[PDB]
Paper text:
The production of PIA depends on the expression of the icaADBC operon, and TcaR and IcaR are a weak and a strong negative regulator of transcription of the ica locus, respectively. The overall structure of each monomer could be divided into two functional domains, one is the dimerization domain and the other is the winged helix-turn-helix (wHTH) DNA binding domain. In addition, the wHTH DNA binding domain is composed of α2-α3-α4-βA-W1-βB which adopts the winged-helix-fold, and the amino acid sequences of this domain are highly conserved.
To clarify whether the ssDNA binding site of TcaR is close, or identical, to the dsDNA binding site, a TcaR quadruple mutant (4 positively charged amino acids responsible for DNA binding mutated to alanines to produce R71A/K73A/R93A/K95A) was designed and its ssDNA and dsDNA binding ability tested. The mutant failed to interact with either dsDNA or ssDNA. This indicated that these amino acids are essential for binding in both ssDNA and dsDNA. Interestingly, the association rate of GC33 ssDNA is two-times higher than IcaR DNA1, but the dissociation rate of IcaR DNA1 is the lowest compared to the DNA fragments tested in this study, suggesting different modes of interaction occurs in ssDNA-TcaR and dsDNA-TcaR complex. Taken together, we demonstrate that TcaR shows a higher binding affinity to ssDNA than to dsDNA, and several antibiotics could regulate the ssDNA binding activity of TcaR. This indicated that TcaR markedly inhibits DNA replication and that the mechanism of inhibition, at least in part, involves interaction with viral ssDNA. The observed biological differences point to a remarkable plasticity of TcaR.
Author numbering:
A (entry chain B): 5 to 85, 95 to 151
B (entry chain A): 3 to 85, 95 to 151
The structure:
């Protein structure tokens, strides 16, 4: 009933704990820190302004600037005419990120029935839609 | 390309959950006067009690701040210490009630039109995957 809300909070805390560990090597190699990639993670999807990044994060604007800048500076993020995209060097990062997510996601979904995963992704697309429809409303 | 579709979705999914929980809790974290990060640090205590180290990589984001924001919790006097594990206030639970409360006033009103076999199967699948993930972790 709402053991769901906890499970979710726990499911998400575990994919973050795990993601971080598998990405530690790739992050130091790039000098980029976790939140910096985690922003490299948001911008993978769409081209935000530093303001849009804070609101979509709950954190202190100041730190979003610490990060946004250290990034451009690193030529990983490529500002556009303040709407920022992903520098082509920041692309090769993302390629190497899903390259690892995948060798573990499949390693844990060897035995699954896609015809079964299908239906849950349908349910998660609808909840997702409903959650996005709240991005709005104020 | 191939199965990257399902995780890219899973990530776009967590993202929105984070974005929303964030938005839906400002007015509330602001009303208790705490940051989000010292709140995340606060939901992990509604479970049990935590050590500065117990959270370090277990949170992901390092270990420095673990104390820096633990102290303002200590000091804003709404999360109790232990020896280096830490429990919760008991007027901090008051808050977590306020949190858990409003997060449902909305999540059910966001999933109420399904009935069961539907949702239970998503849960069952995320559970196995959560089982997998954890077993797979196993490290410092």
């Amino acid at each position: 009933i709402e053991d769901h809300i906890s499970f979710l909070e726990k499911f998400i805390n575990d994919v973050n704990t795990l993601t971080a560990k598998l990405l530690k090597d790739l992050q130091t190699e790039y000098g980029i820190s976790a939140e910096q990639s985690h922003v490299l993670n948001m911008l993978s999807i769409e081209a935000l302004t530093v303001g849009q990044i804070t609101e979509k994060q709950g954190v202190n604007k100041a730190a979003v600037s610490r990060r946004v800048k250290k990034l451009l500076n690193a030529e990983l993020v490529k500002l556009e005419k303040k709407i920022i995209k992903l520098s082509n060097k920041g692309k090769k990062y993302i390629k190497e990120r899903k390259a690892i997510m995948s060798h573990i996601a499949s390693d844990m979904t060897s035995d699954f029935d896609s015809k079964e995963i299908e239906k849950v992704r349908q349910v998660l697309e609808i909840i997702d839609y409903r959650i996005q429809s709240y991005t709005s409303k104020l």
